[PDB]
Amino acid sequence: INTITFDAGNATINKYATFMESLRNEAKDPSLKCYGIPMLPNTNSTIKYLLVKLQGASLKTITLMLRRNNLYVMGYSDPYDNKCRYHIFNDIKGTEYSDVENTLCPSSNPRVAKPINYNGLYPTLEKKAGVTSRNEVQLGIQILSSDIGKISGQGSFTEKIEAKFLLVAIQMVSEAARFKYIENQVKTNFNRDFSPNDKVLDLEENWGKISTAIHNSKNGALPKPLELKNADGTKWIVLRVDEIKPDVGLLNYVNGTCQAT
Numbered sequence: 001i002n003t004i005t006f007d008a009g010n011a012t013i014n015k016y017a018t019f020m021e022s023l024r025n026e027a028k029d030p031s032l033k034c035y036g037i038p039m040l041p042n043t044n045s046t047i048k049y050l051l052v053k054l055q056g057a058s059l060k061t062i063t064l065m066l067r068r069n070n071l072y073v074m075g076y077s078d079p080y081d082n083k084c085r086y087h088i089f090n091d092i093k094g095t096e097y098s099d100v101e102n103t104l105c106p107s108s109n110p111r112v113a114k115p116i117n118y119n120g121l122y123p124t125l126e127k128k129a130g131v132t133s134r135n136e137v138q139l140g141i142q143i144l145s146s147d148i149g150k151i152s153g154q155g156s157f158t159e160k161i162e163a164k165f166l167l168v169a170i171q172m173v174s175e176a177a178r179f180k181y182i183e184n185q186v187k188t189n190f191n192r193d194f195s196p197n198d199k200v201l202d203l204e205e206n207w208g209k210i211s212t213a214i215h216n217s218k219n220g221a222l223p224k225p226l227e228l229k230n231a232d233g234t235k236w237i238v239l240r241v242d243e244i245k246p247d248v249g250l251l252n253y254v255n256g257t258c259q260a261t
């Protein structure tokens with residue numbers, strides 16, 4: 001399928017909202033769904049990967065590659081020195097590595113590797129970015145755009161601006177597609193840089209747990225209380241699907257049948 005493109009350089013709320021629904025519809029399994037929330041396919045889908053190309057105000061682009069099963073960013077490419085430069089995490093190896101390498105930069109055209117010499121987990125990217133927690137890294141449409149410019153087409157760049165770019169892009173593409181609440185935090189703060197609040201980090205952290213709970217609900221009631229966090233960090237106890245459903249855009253794959261609507 002189509003590369004999903006988003007222009008951060010000339011963005012509006014409505015263009016970002018279109019981007020998110022295009023991403024959720026290409027990513028979802030067409031028939032899996034629980035309580036009306038679409039689910040991701042499992043690892044034997046016909047299409048296993050999705051490509052997302054981001055463009056900044058400088059008009060330079062970066063293309064992210066995502067595993068469709070769980071929306072994980074595996075690596076990215078940029079136009080560099082008349083070549084396709086592919087950047088892959090140090091733990092993507094074998095079959096995956098070269099479906100990534102060869103889908104980001106076709107073997108029939110000039111290309112070059114520039115490894116990401118660390119993995120894609122949040123503790124690793126926070127360490128590389130120089131912060132204690134990723135709430136110290138600001139998100140926003142201008143920051144994503146300036147960050148594309150600092151990497152795309154550049155010979156040299158630091159591991160600190162690369163890992164800040166990836167914390168920003170993972171949350172504004174993958175976490176925003178998974179959670180309607182994070183998509184709504186970006187649209188609210190559309191014209192300013194903002195820091196992710198406590199409910200944003202708590203949802204990011206409990207995606208798998210939320211999906212399993214919704215899938216296992218009987219007549220709209222969660223198997224057991226789900227303890228999450230409000231925007232100010234206070235405890236939030238969730239007992240029913242309709243309480244949490246406003247914040248969720250996609251379920252992580254969970255095997256078996258569930259109430260579809």
Ligand SMILES: *[C@@H]1O[C@H](CO)[C@@H](O)[C@H](O)[C@H]1NC(C)=O
Pocket residue numbers: 255256257
């Ligand atoms: C997945 O669910 C199906 C349908 O209930 C079941 O037959 C199968 O054993 C499950 N697979 C695993 C690994 O649990």
Ligand SMILES: Nc1ncnc2[nH]cnc12
Pocket residue numbers: 071072073074120121122170174175
């Ligand atoms: N590489 C990544 N892609 C998507 N979501 C993530 N959350 C943690 N790391 C991530």
